[PDB]
Amino acid sequence: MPEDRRFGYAIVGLGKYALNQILPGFAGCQHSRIEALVSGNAEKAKIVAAEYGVDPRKIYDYSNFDKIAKDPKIDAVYIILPNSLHAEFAIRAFKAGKHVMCEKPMATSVADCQRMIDAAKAANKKLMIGYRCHYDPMNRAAVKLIRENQLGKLGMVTTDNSDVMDQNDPAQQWRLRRELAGGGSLMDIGIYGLNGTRYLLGEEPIEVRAYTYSDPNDERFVEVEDRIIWQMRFRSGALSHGASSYSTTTTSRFSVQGDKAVLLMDPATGYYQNLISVQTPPANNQFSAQLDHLAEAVINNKPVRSPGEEGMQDVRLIQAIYEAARTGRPVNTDWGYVRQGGY
Amino acid sequence: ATLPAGASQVPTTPAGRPMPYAIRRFGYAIVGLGKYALNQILPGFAGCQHSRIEALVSGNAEKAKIVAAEYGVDPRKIYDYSNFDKIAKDPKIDAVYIILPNSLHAEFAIRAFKAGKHVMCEKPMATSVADCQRMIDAAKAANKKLMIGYRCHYDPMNRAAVKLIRENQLGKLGMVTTDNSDVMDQNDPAQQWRLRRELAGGGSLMDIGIYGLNGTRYLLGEEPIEVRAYTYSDPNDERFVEVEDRIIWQMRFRSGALSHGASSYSTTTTSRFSVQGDKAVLLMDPATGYYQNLISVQTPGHANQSMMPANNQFSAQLDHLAEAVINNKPVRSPGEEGMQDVRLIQAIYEAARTGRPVNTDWGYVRQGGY
Amino acid sequence: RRFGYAIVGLGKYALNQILPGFAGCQHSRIEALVSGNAEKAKIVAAEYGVDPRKIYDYSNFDKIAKDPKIDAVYIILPNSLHAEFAIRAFKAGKHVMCEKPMATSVADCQRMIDAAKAANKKLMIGYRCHYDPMNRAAVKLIRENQLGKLGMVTTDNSDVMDQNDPAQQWRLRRELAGGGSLMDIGIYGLNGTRYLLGEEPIEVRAYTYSDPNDERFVEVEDRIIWQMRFRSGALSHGASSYSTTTTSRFSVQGDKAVLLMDPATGYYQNLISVQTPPANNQFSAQLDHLAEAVINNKPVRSPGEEGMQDVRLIQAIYEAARTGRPVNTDWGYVRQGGY
Amino acid sequence: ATLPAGASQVPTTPAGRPMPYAIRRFGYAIVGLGKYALNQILPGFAGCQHSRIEALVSGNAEKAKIVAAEYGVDPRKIYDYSNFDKIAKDPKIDAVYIILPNSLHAEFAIRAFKAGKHVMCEKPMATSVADCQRMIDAAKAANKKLMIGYRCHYDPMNRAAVKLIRENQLGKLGMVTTDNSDVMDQNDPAQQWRLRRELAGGGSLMDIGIYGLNGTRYLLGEEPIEVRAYTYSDPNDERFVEVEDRIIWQMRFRSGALSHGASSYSTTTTSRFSVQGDKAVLLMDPATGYYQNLISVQTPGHANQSMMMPANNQFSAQLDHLAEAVINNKPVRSPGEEGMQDVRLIQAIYEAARTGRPVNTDWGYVRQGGY
Ligand SMILES: NC(=O)C1=CN([C@@H]2O[C@H](COP(=O)(O)OP(=O)(O)OC[C@H]3O[C@@H](n4cnc5c(N)ncnc54)[C@H](OP(=O)(O)O)[C@@H]3O)[C@@H](O)[C@H]2O)C=CC1
Ligand SMILES: NC(=O)C1=CN([C@@H]2O[C@H](COP(=O)(O)OP(=O)(O)OC[C@H]3O[C@@H](n4cnc5c(N)ncnc54)[C@H](OP(=O)(O)O)[C@@H]3O)[C@@H](O)[C@H]2O)C=CC1
């Protein structure tokens, strides 16, 4: 519902996602509000502040970021910086006594994910990873009918997530630098397929195989991978195969095959219009629903559906896939992860 | 094989970065946030080239609240059926898309024209011929375009059917057959306006039977000059106590062609058109579905040919009015076209009511062709 | 091969589909021929291997009582001559198989049922669709209630009438054909709506139109549309045309699902389809039904009565289209044995 | 205006009438009266122009008799597997169409060629890369054409997908995805030839995944040079004691395009192909159905643009294609060579899944004629 209030957010990094999807996302919020902005660009932030009606005194840069602990109005921070920088600021945010909303991927290494979780506990503050698909009506509906056994026993999941990378786009420049992104299309978007396969099935992969290829003559992939294909096996016996691509156009298509029916999501994880059907032989926008979820969780002191642990699980699975792709051997992933209150 | 300058220059420590890339000159005010608007229309915008959702109008704030969020409409532009006219103050709103129950069509199109906005009204146009007239007049007085929502007029498949017919692929036309139906009540008798005479203006014919009537017309490329009909409903069915369930109507055209069709409110999904000529027979099934319509041609002796974007009807419809305005052109589904269907449906009820043939040759002229 | 057949009239259905149809029979054979063109008769009798010593004509036709090999006769002549020979053939001890429409009047149809009972022989009307695998399947699934309650049936049967085709010519003459498209091909839809619904029409309405300048319809009608209501409450609208190309489409709408038959009543390739929100060819099954019935002391699926019901329902439809007023048809008719 | 000339003149009394009106120069010998032959092929002859059902070859006189009658087939042209070769006599029989379990293909293609006949053989060509060669050689000998039944090669929709790709509408190809699946009856599987390794030569990959393999190839219009794969079956599902249930395969082409696909014997029907370019994406769903295949082209920024005469006649077109080729000294678009390539690749794929290592397939198979 429109009119917002309570929970106060500090947006960090005025980039493509922050400005195109997140800030506009408050409009449909019931508890969340843009209280402050953190940016290394005074001029840009000054323009954003005027637009969303943010008190210009609430514009911090990356150096004085920490001073936000002095403002009770700021309840949480939403980190929308490159991957490599997620950990540092989530941690600095916790030491400042704030809750953290962090975008995906959680961090560029599993150790950092853990440090983030440790810092959160230490401060007794919640850590939520920005998985919008966990609050998307369509995606939830899909998860519902699968739980209501509408597809039968699940046996084959297929996913594909792609997008052409444009080196001129500032946002896509750091995605091509290994240290900033920590990986290629898998880290960036293949993660949606990986994460969806997991919640669509309601299980964890116990084994993984992968392969990756990139045109050695393409300047975009000198450091990170363009296309990568991973195949997984689950305890239930369900199997899956998906890929990510940085050189083919927009694709967000999932498929779940059961012996009763087949589910088709496509677009499956887009920003606006997702469509899902089933073939046999009324809701707030994911962006708004996510922002207010952390608000709800904090205000009503109840668990978040996308906890730091969840973020960690994906990164760890991605490092296993990267390893499989590297050795060309199957990688054991049966390490006992357990999902909080369900997928 | 070197990394692009941009990428390499990106700093690894936190740093300020440029304004990001920012991932529709005709504004619409959607009226009635019901089944059709929410499932077909609003989503239809995503594929438009000139239209966009500028404001909503609903008898349910919460509803509007959520919806405006989903589609990104400024929450201050959520009107009700009272301050509806205040829309006259907003210049961003170029047109109005009335998607309310039949009975309230004319009342809201007129007010809309009074607020200087162009009007897109769903079908059937109105529940009386006279209200149709009223709507047309309000439009011309306010010098604004009036369009009726006949999506099939913007469905590639249907247009492909009209094309092959106009190229004489079927030969002289002799017999058209249509059938359109769906099962009504979902455990809700008097709670369905469609089953309320005062709200719907009619039964299956006014709601889905109109597809067969309009279809027969644009397929033959001509108007009916004579009509006959018969209607029947099980008298022990609460659903049909006010409006009809099944009605069958037979027509004749000035070219000598004939047609028989029916609509039903007690039978499963059906959308089938059939056009017979002396060379071949055309078969559309689904003929007026929402996603993919299929058409087939059968010439004696030869096999059965299927015919051949092919779906953008919802989008095609929204922009058509938009373009028409922006480019000072005539709409393909003017108010007069809607008034024709309503006038014939009236003749049909009269025929079904008296059990005789009703003359309908009043010379309606389809502007711009079918 | 204990059942012999005497084919009368060497026309299209006769040669194009019936004789070749014997090639699949398990209990029947083209015992002898009957024609008014011995020449052609020869050519034919020759091919199918028929003793030219049995190539009768339309007079010596009676001799058939002599041959004890000729169990039954199969008439394939114009409608106006169906009754004549059915009886001429009954007063000879031979069972009868007449083509549709049974006759050109309800009266003659009755005379035909009488003569049959007098010669203690069986009378079966040529309704191939009564023995068409695809058609029976449609009926089966309806009985198994796959379509739910039946409420709307749509039928359309058409073919362009050529006035230079032999078989066609008599179909343009009132006295010979006894009506137009409804009598000749529209009957398939009528009879179909009946065995598909599994009931009879109590009320009938119709309208007919023909180009006043087209010489093909000076006595018979080109197009006719008819609507009917049944006891159960189901309705139906169909039509037949003599000026539009081939069409054979039936549709049965229920509240659970819709059945589509298209082609519905063709000679082959018949297709059916049901949508929700390996037996012998019809031709052979038919001929070998009469043979089987008589041999095993059993009734025929297509009784002479069943064929009389259509002639009566049609006269009613012609009456309805004549007065533009609805006609009552609730006359108790009871399709014995099932549709 | 009154009754026509000859119309108005007809004895309203019995009389003599002239011979009635009338109503395919390539006879066919359908071998195997099974589900496909009976529900798709035979009925499919209806729309042919040149092809015809000349003879039948069944190991079941009953089944054949009726079938023969149904289609108006000479009841004297119902052979069996013993006297099958006798068809050599009858010249009205231009070619044969083998529709038998996989293991029996090579054997009858060969015998038929030794009868001076052309051969139409269903996929997969044979159960071994070896037998495919024996078939090709056998055909080269009798100077007759050999054609493998890849109907999608004649499906209007599939051809359109291929055409739009060749017109660079998707741009440079980079990722292809395929899935083909169907639930194999789970009632006494020991009685199904698809569940018996010696009769099928493999599980889901040999029976339906091959559609994915083959399609990936003609959509890209190039051959894989490297292949990878994995497989797995529920060890307690009696259905898969000799053949695989599900198998996943990844491939790489010289152009650098990649692909990932799978086939399944335990999941509801699926036939979906997707071709991702740098300019747009193509989705086919259904991609290889029996009736109407649908294709859509998703292009960046713009919405989902479905792509829609005739378009429903793959069987006919396939039957006549073999007719025309002969009738018009020209080669078939689906030669024995093209079928061998799939069986070779499938073998490569099965070994990939076994060893667990990539398998080089860069063996130089050129597409004689185009995809
Ligand atoms: N979950 C999802 O649906 C999506 C999530 N994202 C995630 O959001 C995050 C941001 O991505 P996106 O907004 O696409 O990235 P952009 O580069 O558009 O925004 C990056 C922002 O972080 C800032 N920043 C600070 N230091 C640096 C540095 N060295 N390099 C780059 N930026 C810096 C800047 O804001 P300032 O200039 O104000 O300092 C900058 O604009 C990522 O983690 C990404 O994966 C992105 C797209 C979709
Ligand atoms: N072109 C096409 O293919 C189709 C056209 N239509 C036509 O569009 C119109 C809308 O149909 P549809 O959305 O299915 O109908 P619904 O009954 O689902 O929606 C009707 C809406 O108008 C509103 N309204 C205002 N007053 C009333 C009232 N007294 N009773 C009920 N609703 C009221 C409500 O929304 P709110 O709560 O915002 O006030 C409501 O949701 C009809 O004219 C119909 O004939 C329908 C389906 C398809």
Ligand SMILES: NC(=O)C1=CN([C@@H]2O[C@H](COP(=O)(O)OP(=O)(O)OC[C@H]3O[C@@H](n4cnc5c(N)ncnc54)[C@H](OP(=O)(O)O)[C@@H]3O)[C@@H](O)[C@H]2O)C=CC1
């Ligand atoms: N149920 C079905 O699928 C079909 C049924 N029919 C029915 O079959 C019957 C035969 O029709 P059809 O074969 O098409 O028409 P035709 O004229 O081609 O066949 C009728 C045959 O009976 C003869 N005949 C005897 N007297 C006359 C007469 N005075 N005028 C014309 N013919 C005469 C002929 O044999 P000869 O010259 O050898 O004496 C002759 O050609 C009709 O009653 C018709 O409705 C027709 C087509 C299909």
Ligand SMILES: NC(=O)C1=CN([C@@H]2O[C@H](COP(=O)(O)OP(=O)(O)OC[C@H]3O[C@@H](n4cnc5c(N)ncnc54)[C@H](OP(=O)(O)O)[C@@H]3O)[C@@H](O)[C@H]2O)C=CC1
């Ligand atoms: N391209 C396509 O769309 C399809 C291709 N296929 C192909 O067609 C071929 C057969 O498939 P399909 O029609 O489904 O198979 P079925 O199991 O229904 O066909 C088996 C047929 O071959 C015969 N046969 C001869 N010897 C044997 C034996 N040892 N065991 C069983 N049958 C035998 C039979 O005919 P009789 O009883 O007359 O002896 C029989 O009915 C296969 O190569 C398969 O790949 C199958 C389906 C679709």
